Design an enzyme around this catalytic site. Structure first.
Site, PDB file in Angstrom:
ATOM      1  N   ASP A  44       0.825  -1.210   0.000  1.00 61.16           N
ATOM      2  CA  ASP A  44       0.000   0.000   0.000  1.00 61.16           C
ATOM      3  C   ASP A  44       0.870   1.276   0.000  1.00 61.16           C
ATOM      4  OD1 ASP A  44      -2.123  -1.929   0.369  1.00 61.16           O
ATOM      5  OD2 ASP A  44      -1.945  -1.715   2.547  1.00 61.16           O
ATOM      6  N   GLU A  58     -11.334  -0.945  -3.299  1.00 60.15           N
ATOM      7  CA  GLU A  58     -10.579  -0.249  -2.219  1.00 60.15           C
ATOM      8  C   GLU A  58      -9.447   0.586  -2.811  1.00 60.15           C
ATOM      9  OE1 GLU A  58      -9.297  -3.427   0.410  1.00 60.15           O
ATOM     10  OE2 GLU A  58      -7.734  -4.164  -0.917  1.00 60.15           O
ATOM     11  N   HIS A  98      14.450   2.044 -40.073  1.00 59.87           N
ATOM     12  CA  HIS A  98      13.116   1.826 -40.578  1.00 59.87           C
ATOM     13  C   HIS A  98      13.022   2.107 -42.072  1.00 59.87           C
ATOM     14  CE1 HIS A  98      11.864   6.101 -40.790  1.00 59.87           C
ATOM     15  NE2 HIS A  98      12.655   6.245 -39.742  1.00 59.87           N
ATOM     16  N   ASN A 148       8.217   1.885 -42.692  1.00 66.59           N
ATOM     17  CA  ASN A 148       7.850   1.666 -41.284  1.00 66.59           C
ATOM     18  C   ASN A 148       8.355   0.371 -40.667  1.00 66.59           C
ATOM     19  OD1 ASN A 148       6.548   4.194 -40.582  1.00 66.59           O
ATOM     20  ND2 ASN A 148       4.854   3.518 -41.913  1.00 66.59           N
TER      21      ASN A 148
HETATM   22  O1  LIG Z   1       9.808   4.161 -42.714  1.00 67.57           O
HETATM   23  C1  LIG Z   1       9.175   5.258 -43.379  1.00 67.57           C
HETATM   24  C2  LIG Z   1      10.022   5.693 -44.606  1.00 67.57           C
HETATM   25  O2  LIG Z   1      10.052   4.653 -45.631  1.00 67.57           O
HETATM   26  C3  LIG Z   1      11.125   5.012 -46.541  1.00 67.57           C
HETATM   27  O3  LIG Z   1      10.611   5.618 -47.783  1.00 67.57           O
HETATM   28  C4  LIG Z   1      12.050   5.973 -45.753  1.00 67.57           C
HETATM   29  O4  LIG Z   1      13.409   5.522 -45.745  1.00 67.57           O
HETATM   30  C5  LIG Z   1      11.517   5.918 -44.335  1.00 67.57           C
HETATM   31  O5  LIG Z   1      11.780   7.196 -43.731  1.00 67.57           O
HETATM   32  O1  LIG Z   2      -7.465  -5.444   3.368  1.00 69.97           O
HETATM   33  C1  LIG Z   2      -8.462  -5.682   2.365  1.00 69.97           C
HETATM   34  C2  LIG Z   2      -9.692  -6.328   3.008  1.00 69.97           C
HETATM   35  O2  LIG Z   2      -9.343  -7.628   3.593  1.00 69.97           O
HETATM   36  C3  LIG Z   2     -10.228  -8.643   3.018  1.00 69.97           C
HETATM   37  O3  LIG Z   2     -11.414  -8.846   3.808  1.00 69.97           O
HETATM   38  C4  LIG Z   2     -10.644  -8.106   1.658  1.00 69.97           C
HETATM   39  O4  LIG Z   2      -9.625  -8.465   0.711  1.00 69.97           O
HETATM   40  C5  LIG Z   2     -10.696  -6.586   1.887  1.00 69.97           C
HETATM   41  O5  LIG Z   2     -12.000  -6.157   2.332  1.00 69.97           O
END
Ligand SMILES: OC[C@@H]1O[C@@H](O)[C@H](O)[C@H]1O
Ligand SMILES: OC[C@@H]1O[C@@H](O)[C@H](O)[C@H]1O
Ligand SMILES: OC[C@@H]1O[C@@H](OC[C@@H]2O[C@@H](O)[C@H](O)[C@H]2O)[C@H](O)[C@H]1O
Ligand SMILES: [Cl-]
Ligand code: NA
Length: 447
Positions: free
Chosen positions: A12, A188, A422, A425
């Site tokens: 917590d 909670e 790239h 893409n």
């Molecule tokens: O990846 C996008 C583009 O694709 C290609 O035309 C370029 O190299 C790149 O910049």
């Molecule tokens: O500490 C959390 C409480 O304990 C358990 O009773 C349940 O998980 C919740 O109500």
């Protein structure tokens, strides 16, 4: 980047960044018997900061058992700690309490008990938090609506002062969805983060074993937050167990900010194993963890998945397409903008599998899978232990070909002169000769 866990055996977690240059960290301790506090000038510094016990349970009566889930806040020139506690005579009669300190340093200061936060209904209540929206301070908490067949629901109210609500509460969420009702029917741990004129209230649901998770309510910052209609409940968890990264039952979160104030940080706990001996409340092993919140184009927070232990992963954006990030889809690597499945676009830089000072890029959502080339095309694939894989997944980190100071480039280890780049893409490893080639082969880490 963060190194996780921040703190073993602390559940917590609540972290508060103050104007004095320090972060203040409190949490539930396994014995449920006291309130601890530490501070550090940086988030990472909290990991080795020493704890002070600022308050201990009473020997008899109220505030005498199950000291749970403290939060520390600075309000109108004083410190306030919000926590929950049962009685020595009735350890499960949990109610909400407040401490106050006028001291500059809350570690060494003296604390006054401001008593129980009174509510109209007398029932199981815990996890009080406070926050301000559109100039108005609110309290949100978890409390049993007696007329409902469950453990706790979420309530919100305005405040008269830091220990007293004004007017009447509104129930804004009750545990009814399948993932909210495993073991016990629980909402909670409310926590509020604001961004771009919207308010997001995350909360924890189900039992505190591996089924623990986060849900979320969303509203506009200009709305009446006491009108239940202002709030929309997410249909599925916004944060949950990842078997792949070995993180189980993430929840009871808070939010803080990075050192520059520019990045929101998700603060939460989990376990690094699934199955628990006995009753989860007697299992002490929840640990506190930190990871950056990324904001979707649509203005909603993206918490991704609970990341693998160790160093946090990073995202790589393109030099010439600043909003496009390296991501995998059907395991093929590409650059793409507006990545909804955030973890497809997260990788951590680790020592190169082929050594000699190379680096490798491990997938966040598929640990032990790496960016690797085959037929000069880049895929995200599982390390099989082969020498071929090591070589294919190892790169020499170079200064960016189109930006030497801040950029990064990745030269293939087994194919010198070929860079990760790239093209249409899709990611490949190709030689770099033109100005454009150099841009296609330059990336930024965390920008
Ligand atoms: O990846 C996008 C583009 O694709 C290609 O035309 C370029 O190299 C790149 O910049
Ligand atoms: O500490 C959390 C409480 O304990 C358990 O009773 C349940 O998980 C919740 O109500
Ligand atoms: O890169 C691996 C993995 O592929 C993407 O999901 C693939 C997707 O799953 C089915 O719904 C579709 O048939 C298939 O295209 C994930 O985003 C990524 O983790
Ligand atoms: Cl996507
Ligand atoms: Na909390």
């Amino acid at each position: 980047t963060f190194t996780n866990p921040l703190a073993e055996k602390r559940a917590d977690p609540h972290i508060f960044k103050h104007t004095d240059g320090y972060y203040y960290f409190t949490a539930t301790v396994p014995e449920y018997d006291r309130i601890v506090l530490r501070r550090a000038t940086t988030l990472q510094g909290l990991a080795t900061a020493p704890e002070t016990t600022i308050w201990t349970k009473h020997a008899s009566g109220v505030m005498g058992a199950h000291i749970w889930a403290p939060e520390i806040h600075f309000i109108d020139g004083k410190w306030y700690v919000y926590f929950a506690a049962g009685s020595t005579s009735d350890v499960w009669a949990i109610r909400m309490y407040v401490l106050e300190s006028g001291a500059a340093n809350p570690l060494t200061g003296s604390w006054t008990e401001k008593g129980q936060i009174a509510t109209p209904v007398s029932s199981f209540s815990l996890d009080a938090t406070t926050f301000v929206v559109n100039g108005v301070r609110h309290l949100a908490w978890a409390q049993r609506n007696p007329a409902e067949d469950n453990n706790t629901s979420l309530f919100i109210a305005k405040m008269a002062n830091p220990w007293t609500i004004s007017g009447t509460p509104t129930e804004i969420s009750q545990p009814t969805l399948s993932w909210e009702t495993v073991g016990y029917k629980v909402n909670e741990g409310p926590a509020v983060i604001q961004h771009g004129g919207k308010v997001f209230l995350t909360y924890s649901a189900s039992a505190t074993d591996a089924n623990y998770c986060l849900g979320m309510l969303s509203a506009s910052a200009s709305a009446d937050l006491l009108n239940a209609a202002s709030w929309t409940k997410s249909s599925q968890p916004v944060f949950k167990t990842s078997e792949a990264t070995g993180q189980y039952g993430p929840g009871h979160n808070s939010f803080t900010v990075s050192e520059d104030g520019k990045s929101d940080i998700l603060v939460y706990h989990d376990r690094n194993y699934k199955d628990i001996s006995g009753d989860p409340l007697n299992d002490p092993n929840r640990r506190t963890r930190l990871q950056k919140v990324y904001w979707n184009a649509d203005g909603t927070p993206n918490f991704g998945i609970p990341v693998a232990d160790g160093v946090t992963p990073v995202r790589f954006s393109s030099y010439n397409y600043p909003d496009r990030y390296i991501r995998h889809w059907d395991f093929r690597a590409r650059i793409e903008a507006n990545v909804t499945n955030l973890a497809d676009s997260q990788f951590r830089v680790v020592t190169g599998l082929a050594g000699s000072g190379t680096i490798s890029l491990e997938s966040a959502n598929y640990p032990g899978y790496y960016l690797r080339h085959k037929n000069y095309e880049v895929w995200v694939e599982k390390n099989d232990g082969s020498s071929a894989f090591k070589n294919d997944a190892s790169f020499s980190r170079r200064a960016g070909l189109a930006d030497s100071a801040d950029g990064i480039a990745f030269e293939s280890y087994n194919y010198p002169g070929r860079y990760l780049r790239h093209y249409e893409n899709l990611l490949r490893i190709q030689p770099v000769s033109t100005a454009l080639d150099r841009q296609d082969a330059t990336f930024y880490a965390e920008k």
